[PDB]
């Protein structure tokens, strides 16, 4: 993540699925963790969804998220939107 360093990402070709984030993490752009003017919903590779792990918050990787994560307009222009599958594999 932008702040916590040891957090590792996925970075695969995103699928049709949309990543979920919990109400606790709601509002953060999964890359920069910004609250401003979100744009496009996150898309994750199928390898990050499958079973129960699909329900996890793509940000904090623990809680079960209801909400969809959106990229901000700064990351959508920086292109990090399309970089790959954001997810946090290690808890940190």
């Amino acid at each position: 993540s932008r702040h916590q360093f040891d957090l590792i990402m996925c970075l695969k070709q995103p699928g049709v699925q949309t990543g979920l984030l919990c109400e606790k993490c709601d509002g953060k752009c999964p890359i920069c963790d910004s609250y401003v003017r979100p744009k496009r919903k996150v898309r994750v590779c199928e390898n990050c969804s499958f079973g129960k792990q699909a329900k996890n918050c793509i940000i904090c990787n623990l809680n079960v998220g209801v909400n969809d994560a959106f990229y901000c307009w700064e990351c959508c222009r920086l292109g990090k939107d399309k970089d790959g599958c954001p997810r946090i594999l290690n808890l940190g």
Partner: protein, 1186 residues
């Protein structure tokens, strides 16, 4: 201090014509309640997109879709087990599957799912540029030129569903020519040619892939190494009758192969060759293969680089065994075509990457497989067949052609006022003048006696239900009357001794003629006779100022005091007058009323003071006032049929034209729409056309302006004819639609037909068996002294050869007394050419041969023997190729590779007058341009523009400014002294400006002191010289002024002081891939403030729709909905370098097509004016600025 900050308004007038992609699906069902037919095609060029249908055997524009603002790098239709909607891949990596839908009253393109892939740019890793879809539509596959390949498994449901991508990644294998093999539902299988990126030797190896629906991944199957010479792959559908084992056709250069999946069968069949094999002869190749199967007969069509179209069928070879054979033959060929399709109908659509897309229906279908003579077999793989091409065109029959200029190399701007663009045709080699003016035919004109004024046309009441129609002319002293019938135009009571202010038909079979001194009420009697039932005269006598009328209704205004109101009695023919005084309180200028209906409310009255009033027809009342400029020259009131809006078209003296929305009930004057056209008091007239029926008003001035209103839009326009004195709609039994009778300003009657109208989509008309010219055009030239005389220079593909074809005025010229209209130059090839006049009375032509020789010529115009006579003068050897040259004062200003030579005129050969050695940075000079002989801007291949100044008595050009960054400049011009236009090889359109620190120095100093002598530079400049000698060597730098990205490659810029008399001088450019667009400097500020706000709206508008659609889902449409593609505007248009001051109007134009709900949804983000005034400002640019 005034901020320079040039604000340019980009418009695409004509949209990119080189069609790179096509798809065969059936998208929309239109005009038919229930119909399903596979015959239709959608074709895409990068940004621009079009949808054509045939169904008639003749191709048809359906709708030109909104600009996508991206680079479409592949497009393929998909058919799933339904309306067939096309899968579209572009930059941003997004796989965007779009369905063409009918929304509101037009066809709009809706997006279903866009899947993010790679990043936003044109990349090698980007899984685009190679795309194909399973012929059964089960899965779509994208790949990359190098790195990786992704294949989605497409599924349909109540909502479309794209399965997760299936990845295969081969690091060093560069992919080329994706070709997918059809299947029986067994398993999807695609085929590629992988060339290794990192290797010691060149190795091109085909590879097969079978995607396994069971295991859900792509599987490498057979890797077959073939010679490095490989070109392409095509898919052989089955071979089910002969002996899952797919077979592919690998086009090599000089021969063809076909290969098995299991490698059992590899068949080599040598591709035949032409008889002539003119000059340079490549091993050739086949560019495009295609497959077709019917009635157990499947043949494929593969075309060579020469355009030779071939077929293959498979034979079992019953003697040996049942095994495939491969049989080539010969067809009608064609010009080189990028891609080929075939309808379920026998129509074969040939999409040419060269110039024009054209459709066929094949009948002969080609030679039978039985003939051993002309057909080659797989029996003996080593063999050769020579064949002479056939221009007789037996096999294929052209049905429809699509006029397009894909490779527009150069152009000149002819007839500056009607923006006419003179440019060659690449293949056909015909002169193409594409014009902004309305296309106007002229037929059977007749010379009228001199000194004519106005014109009218009224149906002849004498013959009811007959073609006879009375045409009325006017002279100041006399009035002429004429009779009209089909092919019969004849001449004939009434009043011939006085001018006719007005004349019109009343009710049925009655006429009234209003003249200055008195009126006439005329009725038909018999055939050639007419009788006045009543005549009107002022009580004490007066000169009538003006007259207007309706169908059953009439108004005349005398000198000053009162106005006169007439009606006709129903059930009979009579005239009545009211007893009342409409004093009007002033002298009435001119009167206007709707003549379209029998009863027209709200008379429009004008005053000599320059004000306009409305008259309610309770009864009369003045509800509105207009104080406008100069006295009204003429005015007309017209209510259109479609929307029912009543528009008051008010022409003014000095050439200002105006238009007004008129409320029916209130009669208020709102929605002022003005214009300035020519210098002359304008005239107006009313006509009715189609293109749904339609009505326009012709405007007579120094130019001729048809003002017509399309749906929710209107554009005033110049007409192709120079001038028209008076104009009125005409009809003849000889087929007449849009037909018109008019008169030129010379006082000569003429008949004409208007054809094409400059809509938002077209904005032009293009004035131009199989036809291919061996000569491919090179450049285009025009004489400085003659305002427009355009000389063309072409080349030969073959032994080096040239031709020169000069045209002035209507059509070309003869050469001497010879029949030929062109000149042939043997052994002369032209790398670059320019015409020069060394003396004012002599005209020379300049060729630069690839032999590195400078050739001088002399042009002659025979003048009433008129012909062009070219004469070879001198011969001069040149060190460089001379990529760029131009006219300096009295001299030729040419650029060597390194250095700039200025040649004078010597005899027996031309001399070097001066030479200027370039700064070390400049390797070559692509193009260069001058400012008033004092200054130059010199371009490079690698580096950017550098400006020079000519110093007399120093006999040298001194560079005074560098450029900031490296830019590859194809074409370059001057707007001004201090600023420069330039384009890029890569598509950037930029404009640079010298800094004021430099402008002060050069304005305050003489050039002679720059090279040597005392010029005092601020401390910073010198410190930049010793600190950074490489960049600041030229001691100044261009601050970026305007930057823009047009995905085309700009061939020609031209700076026009006015576009169709418009005040703001524009710069118009033609691109190579073909396009013409403009940059309009915006006066004031709030122009660019409102434009900037509208562009900002439309930029994220797709995101605004997505956030609204998101919120409504929170309380209870993808992200790229409104843009249809993932590319942001600022991102796409920024691209190479960020747009600086240029606001892109091509975006704001898309706001016009959106539905009222969407538009009003977007404009709420502004505290500023309403959607209606938005559309006003948007449509203001094409009207007023050009």
């Amino acid at each position: 201090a005034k901020d320079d900050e040039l604000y340019l308004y980009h418009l695409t007038l004509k949209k990119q014509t080189n069609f790179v992609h096509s798809c065969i699906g059936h998208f929309v069902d239109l005009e038919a309640g229930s119909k399903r037919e596979q015959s239709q095609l959608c074709v895409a060029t990068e940004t621009h997109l079009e949808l054509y249908d045939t169904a008639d055997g003749e191709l048809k524009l359906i709708a030109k879709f909104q600009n996508l603002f991206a680079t479409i790098t592949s497009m393929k239709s998909l058919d799933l087990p339904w309306p067939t909607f096309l899968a579209l891949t572009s930059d941003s990596g997004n796989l965007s599957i779009v369905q063409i839908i009918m929304h509101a009253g037009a066809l709009r393109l809706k997006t279903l799912v866009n899947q993010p892939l790679t990043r936003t740019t044109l990349r090698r890793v980007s899984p685009i540029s190679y795309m194909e879809i399973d012929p059964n539509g089960r899965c779509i596959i994208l790949s990359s030129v190098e790195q990786n390949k992704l294949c989605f498994l497409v599924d349909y449901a109540q909502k479309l569903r794209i399965s997760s991508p299936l990845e295969i990644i081969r690091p060093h294998m560069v992919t080329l020519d994706m070709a997918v093999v059809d299947v029986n539902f067994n398993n999807p299988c695609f085929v590629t040619l992988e060339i290794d990126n990192a290797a010691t030797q060149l190795s091109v190896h085909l590879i097969f892939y079978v995607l396994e629906l069971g295991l859900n991944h792509i599987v490498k199957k057979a890797d077959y190494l073939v010679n490095p010479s490989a070109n392409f792959v095509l898919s052989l559908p089955d071979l089910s009758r002969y002996n899952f084992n797919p077979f592919v056709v690998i086009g090599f250069e000089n021969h063809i192969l076909v290969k098995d999946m299991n490698g059992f069968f590899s068949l080599k069949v040598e591709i035949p060759k032409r008889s002539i094999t003119n000059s340079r002869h490549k091993n050739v190749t086949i560019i495009s293969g295609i497959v077709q199967k019917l009635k157990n007969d499947f043949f494929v069509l593969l075309q060579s680089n020469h355009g030779d179209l071939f077929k293959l069928t498979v034979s079992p070879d019953t003697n040996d065994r049942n095994r495939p054979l491969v049989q080539l033959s010969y067809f009608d060929t064609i010009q080189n075509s990028h891609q080929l399709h075939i309808f379920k109908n026998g129509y074969l659509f040939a999409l040419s990457e060269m110039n024009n897309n054209f459709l066929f229906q094949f009948e002969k279908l080609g030679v039978e497989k039985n003939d051993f003579s002309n057909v080659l077999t797989s029996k003996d793989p080593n063999k050769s067949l020579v064949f002479e091409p056939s221009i007789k065109l037996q096999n294929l029959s052209i049905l429809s052609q699509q006029l397009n200029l894909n490779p527009s190399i150069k152009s000149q701007i002819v007839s500056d006022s009607p923006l006419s663009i003179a440019t060659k045709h690449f293949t056909n080699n015909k002169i193409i003048t594409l014009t902004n003016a309305v296309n106007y035919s002229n037929l059977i004109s007749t010379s009228l006696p001199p000194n004519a004024t106005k014109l009218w046309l009224i149906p002849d009441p004498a013959t009811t239900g007959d073609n006879n129609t009375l045409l009325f002319i006017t002279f100041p002293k006399k009035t002429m009357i004429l009779q009209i019938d089909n092919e019969s135009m004849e001449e004939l009571f009434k009043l011939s001794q006085d001018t006719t202010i007005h004349t019109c038909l009343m009710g049925s079979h009655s006429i009234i003629q209003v003249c200055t001194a008195e009126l006439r009420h005329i009725v038909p009697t018999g055939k050639s006779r007419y009788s006045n039932k009543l005549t009107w005269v002022p009580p004490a006598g007066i000169r009538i100022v003006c007259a207007t009328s309706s169908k059953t209704q009439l108004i005349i205004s005398l000198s000053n005091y009162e106005l006169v109101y007439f009606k006709i009695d129903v059930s009979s023919d009579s005239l009545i007058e009211l007893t009342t005084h409409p004093e009007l309180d002033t002298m009435p200028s001119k009167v206007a009323i709707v003549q379209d209906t029998q009863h027209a409310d709200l008379l429009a009255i004008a005053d000599n003071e320059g004000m306009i009033k409305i008259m309610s027809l309770d009864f009369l009342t003045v509800i509105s006032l207009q104080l406008v400029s100069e006295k009204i020259s003429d005015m007309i009131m017209v209510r259109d049929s479609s929307i029912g809006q009543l528009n008051l078209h008010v022409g003014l003296e000095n050439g200002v034209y105006m238009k007004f929305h008129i409320g029916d009930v209130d009669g208020s004057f709102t929605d002022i729409k003005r214009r300035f056209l020519g210098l002359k008091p304008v005239s107006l007239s009313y006509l009715r056309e189609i293109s749904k029926w339609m009505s326009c008003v012709v405007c007579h001035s120094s130019s001729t302006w048809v003002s017509y209103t399309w749906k929710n839009v209107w554009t005033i326009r110049q007409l192709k004819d120079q001038n028209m004195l008076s104009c009125s709609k005409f009809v003849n039994a000889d087929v007449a639609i849009n037909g018109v009778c008019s008169i030129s300003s010379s006082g000569r009657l003429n008949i004409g037909r208007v054809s094409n109208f400059p809509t938002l989509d077209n904005w032009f008309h293009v004035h131009e068996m199989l036809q291919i010219s061996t000569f491919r055009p090179r450049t285009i030239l025009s004489f400085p002294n003659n305002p427009k005389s355009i000389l063309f220079i072409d080349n030969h593909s073959g032994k080096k050869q040239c031709r020169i074809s000069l045209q002035i005025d209507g059509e070309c010229l003869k050469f001497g007394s010879s029949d030929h209209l062109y000149k042939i130059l043997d052994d002369i090839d032209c790398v670059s050419a320019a015409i020069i006049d060394f003396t004012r009375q002599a005209d020379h032509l300049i060729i630069c041969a690839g032999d590195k020789r400078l050739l001088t010529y002399k042009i002659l115009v025979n003048k009433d023997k008129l012909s062009f006579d070219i004469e070879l003068l001198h011969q001069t050897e040149i060190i460089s190729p001379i990529h760029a040259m131009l006219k300096f004062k009295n001299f030729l200003l040419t650029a060597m590779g390194s250095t700039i030579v200025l040649y004078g005129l010597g005899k027996k050969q031309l001399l070097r007058r001066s030479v200027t050695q370039t700064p070390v940075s400049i390797t070559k000079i692509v193009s260069m341009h001058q400012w008033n002989y004092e200054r130059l801007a010199v371009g490079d291949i690698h580096e950017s523009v550098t400006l020079f100044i000519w110093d007399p008595a120093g006999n040298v050009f001194i560079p005074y400014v560098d450029d900031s960054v490296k830019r590859h400049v194809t074409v370059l011009k001057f707007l001004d002294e201090a600023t420069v236009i330039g384009a890029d090889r890569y598509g950037n359109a930029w404009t640079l400006r010298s800094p004021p620190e430099c402008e002060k120095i050069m304005s305050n100093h003489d050039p002679s002191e720059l090279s040597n002598g005392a010029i005092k530079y601020p401390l910073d400049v010198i410190t930049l010289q010793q600190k950074l000698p490489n960049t600041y060597d030229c001691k100044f730098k261009f601050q970026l002024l305007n930057h823009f990205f047009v995905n085309d490659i700009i061939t020609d810029f031209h700076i026009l002081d006015s576009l169709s008399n418009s005040d703001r001088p524009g710069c118009i450019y033609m691109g190579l891939q073909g396009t013409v667009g403009c940059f309009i400097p915006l006066l004031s500020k709030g122009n660019v403030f409102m434009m900037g706000n509208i562009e900002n709206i439309m930029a994220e508008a797709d995101d605004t729709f997505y956030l609204d659609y998101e919120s409504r889902k929170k309380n209870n449409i993808c992200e790229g909905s409104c843009s249809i593609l993932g590319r942001d505007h600022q991102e796409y248009r920024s691209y190479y370098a960020p747009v600086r001051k240029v606001i892109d109007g091509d975006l704001c134009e898309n706001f016009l097509r959106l539905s009222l709900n969407e538009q009003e949804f977007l404009a709420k983000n502004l505290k500023s004016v309403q959607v209606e005034d938005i559309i006003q400002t948007i449509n203001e640019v094409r009207t007023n600025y050009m």
